[PDB]
């Protein structure tokens, strides 16, 4: 339609149009690390593909935690269950196709350090309620109380500040209106130069409607979010003797 | 039109009181005679949020004690005690712990200490970057050891240490308790990673639980008439 | 040895000192400095950052997600207000949270510009026209479309602009300051199969010109 | 217009009791400033005491008397000691007021416990 | 350090110091000084303008 | 005199001071520095120095010479594992009264390298092989002789290398560590008249990429 550009990594292929607004994280490219390390180069740079996500009118959002998304994809995962320290930079791709009689808008961020709050206050938050891997965790649009649950509310995003504020991380707005899809590339943030890949969430993806899905009384009730994540730069510790 | 003042360092390297320490120098129960203080900066609600708003930092700190002394009453407050010495030792990360006032961890040798006389000025101790790591974390999304064992974000690496304090003479006749007051001011802050104010208040100096809060205050109208 | 004379201000503990200290801890090897993305040497580059505004802030709408959501539909009138608020980023009720109004609550002087941004979240097919009008500081709220005309106004169509951005002169608190409503102009026009409610949603930053002097502590922050 | 440099002088004097046999340790005494558009306290034990943005002194018995300088902090460019006019909205509000030209204010606690 | 002998004088508050002082509000922006017209330098400026005298001061 | 002015931080004694001090014996001569060999201006020159490790310290056996002796025979399986401690040098118990473990207590941080050595003290006659396999941190400990081999193992022919050297790579504790476990490969082969029971004694020291970053009072000194 509009110069449509085809990216092929590994043995994956995915189509993008020629604008393609790329939002990098804070100016800074995701590359290696300037006792020993070890990538493995190109047989985990390959797009790893979700499921596509339900919004009616109203869904309130859905997040992913990274990388505990990717822990049965293959051989991103092998290499998180073979060796013990790690290291990479992401690549998000966040499209969402609907008709032009459809109308709403999407902040789509990316959180480091987001740590959850529960929703009773002095309790313990399970890890299933954190993450999950597969098909996302959804916000409620009011005060949620579930035993051992993180605290569900969109006007707070589980970490106790105003919703609005969310746009000093990296972020895009689809607009059903003018855009299609969002892009935006992450480096690797840490305190540490490597930590353990289990233990430890780097940054939370978050997708909310602001102006929710609105249509007609015949059209499709019910429009899909493809996620598209690839990792690049990634390397780990590696075992040898020297 | 001079934005020196938004700097991040003329924004954190300001000096707060942080924590009151009470102890005293003759009692029969043997732990009040002598406090602590795990250092952290989750106690002011204040500077809390001001750092807060930023993931990461480093920073030196500057700490200067503000030691004043009042006598308990007794039959006898007509006595001519001396004037007393306080110690204040510094506990790094990895450092033995005292648990009575005549511990031999008191005279240990790398547990830095400074000995005060009454009368002079306060005194003042500065105590450096001391992480593993490069920066201390506000925020960890994450476990420290063992995941689904260990309590979610907790962050073991960024411990700074600990302080206790003692008077250095031996009992005297009358009770004398001492208050001590911690001026903790941060030095040389470099910040990364910046992010929203806290709405919600804090509910403890723990995590970063909460009861949801409202976004703004509510009015009557949406739109605006005249006067 | 030399003779030295003690001035006063002699052994006191000012709280803003600057002096040299001993240290405890010294022959320690401070961990060096890391390249760590994303490095904040100044408060108001957090403030340069649009953010979306409560203006929508009706009673039992705050604790929501359409406290946000500006409704705008087709109206039998014309001359009608869709919105409106007092242009004080800090002291309105509106901005307050706001992460503008969050950097200007830590100051007790302010002064420079601020941006405002309108972004219609409605179908692809609809079309109209707002009057963003400006009401300078000293002047009124008008009560017209007309009465808004006059003044200082921007006429802005949805049908081939999704986004106006309207950069706002002089605003101070210590160096009544305007107002911002919005007036139809047309209905919103729509084909058939196609939902007539939409909404516009706000954002607001600073621009480069924007001083502070006087630090203090926030207004919201109260002790336990 | 002008600096400001302010010297506390700073006495005590017990007030007559059953128990004048004491030995009450040094005191210390607070010296907060309020800047133009800072907090307020209310008590003693009120949370304004313990604020980052309001600077403090603390001075122990025995010194030298305390000393800190204030600075021109007007918005405008000179103080007023004469001002015509309303501050705002004339015919409401005091006559001759002139909201701009104040300087701030500061409160007084001892530090110490009861 | 550096060996140093109190001379008298020390610790009192004499009136007219001239000592330096700190500052209780650094990291602070002073407006800058606009040119108001009638500066005075000097009170002998004042007193160099003539004024009517009450020379019938009878009661 | 001269204007002076006293600043805080008078008047106190801070323990760490660096300040200069007048002489209780001026007029004195000191007697001059002679050459006395083995200076010491490093302490991580002493901990540079191999040391005997007492990997047997099975209970009753501490109290002994036999601690260190680490018994090795022929053996009737091939799998089967000779010895195996966490590698941890200064919270374990193994390498805790260690030399290196003694310097490496009087710090609260340390990192660096760690070198390994295993001799074989048996006859000249005797031959065999064992199976030196290193855990890596996170990784658990082996329960074969097949997935020790697959992990990074290297194996010591006893017939021709008397001593094995296994450099360890990054250990630290603030710059569950690893293990060093050693399996059999096949049995010790004999000939006749020569006794069969033997022993292996280890060594450990560090590289010279070590540091430590913090002292404080060591946890084996009580005081009376």
Redesign the interface.
Same mark, same amino acid.
């Given at each position: 339609s509009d110069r449509v550009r085809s990216i092929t990594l590994g043995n994956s292929t995915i189509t993008t149009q020629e604008s393609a607004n790329v939002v990098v %994280?804070?100016?800074?490219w995701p590359d290696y690390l300037s006792?020993?390390p070890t990538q493995p180069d190109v047989a985990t740079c390959r797009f790893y593909t979700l499921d596509s996500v339900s919004w009616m009118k109203e869904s309130?959002g859905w997040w992913w935690?990274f990388p505990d998304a990717l822990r049965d994809m293959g051989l991103f995962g092998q290499n998180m269950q073979y060796?013990?320290?790690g290291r990479s930079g992401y690549t998000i791709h966040v499209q969402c196709n609907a008709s032009? @009689?459809?109308?709403?808008?999407l902040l789509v961020v990316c959180?480091?350090?987001?740590?959850?709050?529960?929703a009773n206050? $002095?309790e313990?938050?399970?890890?299933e309620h954190l993450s999950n891997g597969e098909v996302a965790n959804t916000f409620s649009?009011t005060?949620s109380s579930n035993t051992n649950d993180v605290?569900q #509310?969109? @006007?707070?995003a589980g970490?106790?500040?105003?919703?609005?504020?969310?746009?000093? @991380?990296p972020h895009q707005?689809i $607009?059903?209106? &003018?855009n299609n899809c969002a892009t935006i590339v992450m480096?690797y943030?840490n /305190?540490?130069?490597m930590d $353990?890949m289990?233990?430890?969430?780097?940054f &939370?993806l978050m997708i909310?409607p @602001?102006?929710?899905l609105?249509? #007609? #009384? %015949? /059209?499709s009730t019910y429009i899909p979010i493809t996620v598209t994540v690839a990792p690049m730069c990634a390397e780990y510790?590696g075992?040898?003797?020297? | 039109h001079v934005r020196s003042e938004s700097s991040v360092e003329n924004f954190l390297s300001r000096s707060a009181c942080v924590y009151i320490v009470e102890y005293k120098t003759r009692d029969d129960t043997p732990d009040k005679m002598y406090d602590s203080w795990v250092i952290n900066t989750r106690q002011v609600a204040q500077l809390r949020r001001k750092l807060e708003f930023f993931t990461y930092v480093r920073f030196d700190v500057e700490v200067t004690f503000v030691i004043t002394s009042v006598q308990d009453d007794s039959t006898r407050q007509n006595t001519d005690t001396p004037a007393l010495t306080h110690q204040i030792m510094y506990v790094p990360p990895g450092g033995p712990i005292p648990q009575a006032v005549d511990d031999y961890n008191w005279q240990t040798s790398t547990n830095p200490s400074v000995f005060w006389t009454e009368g002079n000025a306060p005194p003042r101790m500065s105590i450096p970057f001391m992480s593993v790591g490069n920066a201390y974390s506000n925020f960890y999304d994450g476990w420290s050891h063992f995941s689904q064992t260990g309590v979610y974000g907790f962050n073991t690496l960024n411990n700074m240490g600990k302080l206790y304090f003692r008077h250095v003479n031996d009992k005297t006749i009358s009770p004398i308790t001492s208050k001590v007051r911690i001026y903790f001011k941060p030095k040389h802050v470099k910040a990364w990673v910046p992010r929203p104010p806290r709405l919600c208040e804090y509910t403890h100096k723990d995590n970063v639980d909460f009861e949801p809060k409202g976004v703004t205050t509510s009015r009557t109208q949406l739109t605006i008439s005249n006067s | 040895g030399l003779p030295v004379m003690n001035t006063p201000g002699s052994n006191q503990f000012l709280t803003s000192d600057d002096y040299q200290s001993p240290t405890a801890m010294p022959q320690f090897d401070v961990t060096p400095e890391m390249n760590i993305p994303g490095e904040v040497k100044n408060l108001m580059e957090i403030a340069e950052v649009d953010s979306v505004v409560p203006v929508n802030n009706v009673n039992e709408n705050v604790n929501s997600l359409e406290a946000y959501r500006i409704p705008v539909h087709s109206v039998t009138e014309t001359g009608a207000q869709v919105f409106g608020f007092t242009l004080q980023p800090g002291a309105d009720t509106v901005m307050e949270r706001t992460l503008l109004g969050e950097i200007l609550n830590y100051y007790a002087n302010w002064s420079g510009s601020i941006k405002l941004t309108f972004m219609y979240c409605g179908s692809a097919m609809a079309t109209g026209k707002f009057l963003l009008a400006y009401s300078p500081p000293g002047a009124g709220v008008p009560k017209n479309r007309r009465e808004a005309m006059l003044g200082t106004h921007i006429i802005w169509d949805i049908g081939l602009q999704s986004s106006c951005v309207l950069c706002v002169p002089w605003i101070s608190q210590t160096h009544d300051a305007g107002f911002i409503t919005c007036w139809y102009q047309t209905s919103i026009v729509v084909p058939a199969e196609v939902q007539n409610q939409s909404v516009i949603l706000c954002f607001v930053s600073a621009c480069n010109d924007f001083s502070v002097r006087l630090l203090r502590d926030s207004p919201f922050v109260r002790q336990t």
């Amino acid at each position: 339609s509009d110069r449509v550009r085809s990216i092929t990594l590994g043995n994956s292929t995915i189509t993008t149009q020629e604008s393609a607004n790329v939002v990098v %994280g804070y100016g800074v490219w995701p590359d290696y690390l300037s006792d020993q390390p070890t990538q493995p180069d190109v047989a985990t740079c390959r797009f790893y593909t979700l499921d596509s996500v339900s919004w009616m009118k109203e869904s309130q959002g859905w997040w992913w935690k990274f990388p505990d998304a990717l822990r049965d994809m293959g051989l991103f995962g092998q290499n998180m269950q073979y060796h013990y320290l790690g290291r990479s930079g992401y690549t998000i791709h966040v499209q969402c196709n609907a008709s032009k @009689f459809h109308q709403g808008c999407l902040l789509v961020v990316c959180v480091p350090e987001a740590e959850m709050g529960a929703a009773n206050i $002095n309790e313990k938050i399970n890890r299933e309620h954190l993450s999950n891997g597969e098909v996302a965790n959804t916000f409620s649009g009011t005060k949620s109380s579930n035993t051992n649950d993180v605290q569900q #509310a969109v @006007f707070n995003a589980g970490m106790g500040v105003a919703v609005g504020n969310l746009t000093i @991380f990296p972020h895009q707005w689809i $607009n059903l209106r &003018t855009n299609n899809c969002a892009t935006i590339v992450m480096p690797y943030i840490n /305190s540490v130069p490597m930590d $353990n890949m289990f233990r430890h969430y780097n940054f &939370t993806l978050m997708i909310i409607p @602001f102006a929710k899905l609105d249509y #007609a #009384a %015949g /059209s499709s009730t019910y429009i899909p979010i493809t996620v598209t994540v690839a990792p690049m730069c990634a390397e780990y510790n590696g075992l040898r003797l020297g | 039109h001079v934005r020196s003042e938004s700097s991040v360092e003329n924004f954190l390297s300001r000096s707060a009181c942080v924590y009151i320490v009470e102890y005293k120098t003759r009692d029969d129960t043997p732990d009040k005679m002598y406090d602590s203080w795990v250092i952290n900066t989750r106690q002011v609600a204040q500077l809390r949020r001001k750092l807060e708003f930023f993931t990461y930092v480093r920073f030196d700190v500057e700490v200067t004690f503000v030691i004043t002394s009042v006598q308990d009453d007794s039959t006898r407050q007509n006595t001519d005690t001396p004037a007393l010495t306080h110690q204040i030792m510094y506990v790094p990360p990895g450092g033995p712990i005292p648990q009575a006032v005549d511990d031999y961890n008191w005279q240990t040798s790398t547990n830095p200490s400074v000995f005060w006389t009454e009368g002079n000025a306060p005194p003042r101790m500065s105590i450096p970057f001391m992480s593993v790591g490069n920066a201390y974390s506000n925020f960890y999304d994450g476990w420290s050891h063992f995941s689904q064992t260990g309590v979610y974000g907790f962050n073991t690496l960024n411990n700074m240490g600990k302080l206790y304090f003692r008077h250095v003479n031996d009992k005297t006749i009358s009770p004398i308790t001492s208050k001590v007051r911690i001026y903790f001011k941060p030095k040389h802050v470099k910040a990364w990673v910046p992010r929203p104010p806290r709405l919600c208040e804090y509910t403890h100096k723990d995590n970063v639980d909460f009861e949801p809060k409202g976004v703004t205050t509510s009015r009557t109208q949406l739109t605006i008439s005249n006067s | 040895g030399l003779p030295v004379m003690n001035t006063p201000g002699s052994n006191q503990f000012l709280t803003s000192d600057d002096y040299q200290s001993p240290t405890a801890m010294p022959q320690f090897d401070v961990t060096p400095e890391m390249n760590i993305p994303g490095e904040v040497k100044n408060l108001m580059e957090i403030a340069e950052v649009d953010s979306v505004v409560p203006v929508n802030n009706v009673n039992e709408n705050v604790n929501s997600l359409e406290a946000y959501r500006i409704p705008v539909h087709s109206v039998t009138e014309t001359g009608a207000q869709v919105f409106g608020f007092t242009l004080q980023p800090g002291a309105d009720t509106v901005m307050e949270r706001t992460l503008l109004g969050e950097i200007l609550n830590y100051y007790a002087n302010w002064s420079g510009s601020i941006k405002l941004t309108f972004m219609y979240c409605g179908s692809a097919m609809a079309t109209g026209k707002f009057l963003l009008a400006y009401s300078p500081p000293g002047a009124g709220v008008p009560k017209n479309r007309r009465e808004a005309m006059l003044g200082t106004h921007i006429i802005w169509d949805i049908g081939l602009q999704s986004s106006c951005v309207l950069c706002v002169p002089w605003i101070s608190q210590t160096h009544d300051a305007g107002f911002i409503t919005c007036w139809y102009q047309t209905s919103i026009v729509v084909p058939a199969e196609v939902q007539n409610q939409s909404v516009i949603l706000c954002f607001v930053s600073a621009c480069n010109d924007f001083s502070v002097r006087l630090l203090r502590d926030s207004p919201f922050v109260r002790q336990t």
